[PDB]
Curated annotation (Swiss-Prot), chain A:
Entries under CDD domains matching the protein: RNAP_alpha_NTD
Span list, region Alpha N-terminal domain (alpha-NTD): 1-225
Region of interest (Alpha C-terminal domain (alpha-CTD)), ranges: 227-303
Record note on modification: Acetylated on Lys-275 and Lys-276 in the presence of glucose. PatZ controls acetylation of Lys-276 but not of Lys-275. (Microbial infection) ADP-ribosylated on both alpha subunits by the phage T4 protein ModA. ADP-ribosylated on only one of the alpha subunits by the phage T4 protein Alt.
Enzyme class: transferase
Keyword Transcription recorded: yes
Protein name: DNA-directed RNA polymerase subunit alpha
Domain of life: Bacteria
Family note: Belongs to the RNA polymerase alpha chain family.
Gene Ontology MF terms in the entry: DNA binding; DNA-directed RNA polymerase activity; protein dimerization activity
Gene this chain is encoded by: rpoA
Swiss-Prot record, chain B:
Shown segment, full-protein numbering: 697 to 796 of 1342
Protein name, as recorded: DNA-directed RNA polymerase subunit beta
UniProt organism field: Escherichia coli (strain K12)
Family per similarity comment: Belongs to the RNA polymerase beta chain family.
Domain of life: Bacteria
Applications reported: Co-administration of salinamide and rifampicin or salinamide and myxopyronin suppresses the emergence of resistance to both antibiotics.
Function: DNA-dependent RNA polymerase (RNAP) catalyzes the transcription of DNA into RNA using the four ribonucleoside triphosphates as substrates. Resistance to the antibiotics salinamide A, salinamide B, rifampicin, streptolydigin, CBR703, myxopyronin, and lipiarmycin can result from mutations in this protein.
Disulfide bonds: none
Subunit composition and interactions: The RNAP catalytic core consists of 2 alpha, 1 beta, 1 beta' and 1 omega subunit. When a sigma factor is associated with the core the holoenzyme is formed, which can initiate transcription. The rRNA transcription and antitermination complex (rrnTAC) consists of RNAP, NusA, NusB, NusE (rpsJ), NusG, SubB, ribosomal protein S4, DNA and precursor rRNA; S4 is more flexible than other subunits. In pull-down experiments interacts with CedA.
PTM annotation, UniProt: Acetylated on several lysine residues in the presence of glucose.
Swiss-Prot record, chain D:
Family recorded in the similarity comment: Belongs to the RNA polymerase beta' chain family.
Function: DNA-dependent RNA polymerase (RNAP) catalyzes the transcription of DNA into RNA using the four ribonucleoside triphosphates as substrates.
Name assigned to this protein: DNA-directed RNA polymerase subunit beta'
PTM per Swiss-Prot/TrEMBL: Acetylated on several lysine residues in the presence of glucose.
Gene field: rpoC
Superkingdom to which the source organism belongs: Bacteria
Positions spanned in the full protein: 507 to 556 of 1407
Biotechnology: Co-administration of salinamide and rifampicin or salinamide and myxopyronin suppresses the emergence of resistance to both antibiotics.
Subunit structure: The RNAP catalytic core consists of 2 alpha, 1 beta, 1 beta' and 1 omega subunit. When a sigma factor is associated with the core the holoenzyme is formed, which can initiate transcription. The rRNA transcription and antitermination complex (rrnTAC) consists of RNAP, NusA, NusB, NusE (rpsJ), NusG, SubB, ribosomal protein S4, DNA and precursor rRNA; S4 is more flexible than other subunits.
């Protein structure tokens, strides 16, 4: 009616390939197609969780600026290849895979030691080449879950462990389109089609649900609306003589800060305080690394 | 590589001395990320000689401007090469084409 | 020749397409020129100047 | 200068030509919703101070 | 120099690694004033460590 | 720690008037300021329920570009004055009012025939001016309920003069995104919203209703 918005439903899902999909939302009242589509596109592009390789360790190498005998790729190029491995970790938020290979031929993702939780979606992903018969490579690959893009520099380690930049987002690109919805007896309803290209490690339905959950979670606030310890020690901590202590207590100076803030001319005119006592006080202060005549703001510290 | 060039890339790349060019033709006997060993053809071999060429590539050396000089192989195992072909890509080079 | 090559690849001959705003999803009012250009990185790094 | 020159111009038979508005705020509300073009020639009630 | 299109007419954008070096004695005085460093060497060390 | 995002902490509201407000939220994840602001702006501009004047009929005037004697202004000025009338309707979704006034001076909103179900929020809103002593104005006003804005040129009797329909109670909404930082993370967003309504509802209520409308469109997806 006048205030009754038809609420969209997820109607159709199309799987063109393993990394290409389409999603249909229908129906949509006028003006909501783009309003939902652009927000969903921004959220899907920015904040989708994933799994990425973050550390590598090869047996013979010490740094990424070197080469290994019998391997046709520099270690830096091997790291650049491993940066794009599409993994799926099911239970944990961290895992270590092992790769061992020997003999002439390509080394691809299918040669990673088998594991239960971890799933490889691109077995043909080439990692390197071996061009010598009695040549082998063995490596430990660290995979963990995150989101966004965390470079290696932003985040001691043993010599021989190589860091890799982490790109966690599984979404490669998003597009959307608005078409005319052929509802029973209306012609003012729209249909939203979202075209999604990913790396194969996330299901389209859970991506849509995660984006909508993030949006609705963010949309709640709108519906809602030290001094240094030496200065704190009591003045009796200092090994002052009897006369000096009596003079100080006659001036209501109980903490080290209050004594510190007093200038020498002020204490010279203190009654019953001879110059000898003042020199002794200066001595006991200078022994600990302090002096008469300092200046502190916001004193006392309310304690 | 430049998607739009003028055809002078190969001359500058080859005639600069930064790429390893084959002295004689033959077949790549052994290719590695740090060396190349070519088995020279029979007719180009001199008498009384085991016919092989050894090309040692330079890896991560310092230039006068504190930049990197690094050569990469661009040939496969057991494939023909003729006299004058490019075996390794120097700095700013893609398959023998200048690439800045 | 450039226009013929653009026709072969199924692209508009004028060389201008319709772009969209990334923040609001709204189409820019006029066609925009998009292409591929060869960019270099010169040896003047701000790490040295500061 | 280019933006201020583009927004302050007129076109013959644009979208929304010939309508009457109750002030600048209605002009902005119409432009943002896509009902009228930036170059349409309209009649607006304006208050100025001397 | 780069362009900041968001600044107001009386503002400029300064990198903070430059501002730490330029305004160092003021930082020493401010650190000493509130008791975070009772001596000059303590403030110098604290600024060196970039706490 | 992978499905937790930052949420606003300092929601500051400044009321420049009774119908003009500025709201500030911070901090927000990078890029969410534009998303939330644009979504709210589109919702508040395009789709908001309201009640507004649709058509008018004056006995003395047949066509829009006529000339009514005894009235200082002209017909299009009367239509512009009517288009800005802010009325709350609670009973039904279609009402008819009548204004009959004779004399000299400003014919204002308070002279409309009082109807209990409907309500006029500004009785001091001028409708027209009467110059001649023997000048009387008689007219009928039709008010409907709808959403957003509907120009009179889309809907094209005798004397049934069409008026642009502005159902949405929002006069103007704008937003801005600035930089905000937590101690360590410094690339965060801060959202500033400035909005003015017509007096039917306060800006805070408009923002709340827009957020509710948008959030009710995601029910079939939220886990």
């Amino acid at each position: 009616s006048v205030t009754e918005f038809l609420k969209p439903r997820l109607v159709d899902i199309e799987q063109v390939s393993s990394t290409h999909a389409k999603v249909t939302l229908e129906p949509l009242e006028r003006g909501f197609g783009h309003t939902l589509g652009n927000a969903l596109r921004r959220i899907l592009l920015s904040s989708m969780p994933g799994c990425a390789v973050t550390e590598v360790e090869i047996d013979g190498v010490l740094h990424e600026y070197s080469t290994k005998e019998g391997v046709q790729e520099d270690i830096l190029e091997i790291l650049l290849n491993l940066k794009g491995l599409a993994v799926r970790v099911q239970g944990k938020d961290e895992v270590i895979l092992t790769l061992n290979k020997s003999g002439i031929g390509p080394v691809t993702a299918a040669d990673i030691t088998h594991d239960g939780d971890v799933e490889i979606v691109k077995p043909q992903h080439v990692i390197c080449h071996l061009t010598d018969e009695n040549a082998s490579i063995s490596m430990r690959i660290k995979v963990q879950r995150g989101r966004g893009y965390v470079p290696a520099s932003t985040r001691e380690r043993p010599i021989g462990r190589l860091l890799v930049d982490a790109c966690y987002s599984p979404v490669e690109r998003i597009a959307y389109n608005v078409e005319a919805a052929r509802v029973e007896q209306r012609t003012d309803l729209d249909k939203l089609v979202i075209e999604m290209e990913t790396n194969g490690t996330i299901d389209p339905e859970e991506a849509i649900r995660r984006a909508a959950t993030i949006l609705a979670e963010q949309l709640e606030a709108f519906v809602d609306l030290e001094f240094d310890p030496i200065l704190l020690r009591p003045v009796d901590d200092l090994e002052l003589t009897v006369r000096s202590a009596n003079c100080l207590k006659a001036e209501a100076i109980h903490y080290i800060g209050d004594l510190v803030q007093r200038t020498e001319v002020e204490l010279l005119k203190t009654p019953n305080l001879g110059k000898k006592s003042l020199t002794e006080i200066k001595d006991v202060l200078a022994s600990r690394g302090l002096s008469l005549g300092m200046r502190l703001e916001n004193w006392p510290p309310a304690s | 590589k430049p998607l739009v060039g003028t055809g002078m890339e190969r001359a500058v790349a080859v005639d600069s001395g930064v790429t390893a060019v084959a002295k004689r033709g033959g077949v790549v006997q052994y290719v590695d990320a740090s060396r190349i060993v070519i088995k020279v053809n029979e007719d180009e071999m001199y008498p009384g000689e085991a016919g092989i060429d050894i090309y040692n590539l330079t890896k991560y050396t310092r230039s006068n401007q504190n930049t990197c000089i690094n050569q990469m192989p661009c040939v496969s195992l057991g494939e023909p090469v003729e006299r004058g072909d490019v075996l390794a890509d120097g700095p700013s080079t893609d398959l023998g084409e200048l690439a800045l | 020749e450039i226009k013929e090559l653009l026709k072969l690849g199924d692209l508009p001959t004028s060389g201008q397409i319709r772009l969209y705003d990334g923040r609001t999803g709204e189409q820019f009012e006029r066609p925009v020129t998009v292409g591929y250009m060869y960019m270099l990185k010169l040896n003047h790094l701000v790490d040295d100047k500061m | 200068v280019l933006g201020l020159y583009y927004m302050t111009r007129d076109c013959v038979n644009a979208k929304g030509e010939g309508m009457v508005l109750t002030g600048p705020k209605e002009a902005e509300r119409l432009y943002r919703s896509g009902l009228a073009s930036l170059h349409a020639r309209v009649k607006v009630r304006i208050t100025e101070y001397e | 120099i780069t362009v900041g299109p968001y600044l107001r007419l009386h503002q400029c954008g300064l990198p903070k690694k430059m501002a730490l070096e330029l305004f160092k004695p003021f930082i020493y005085g401010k650190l000493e004033l509130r008791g975070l460093a009772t001596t000059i060497k303590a403030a110098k060390k604290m600024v060196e460590r970039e706490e």
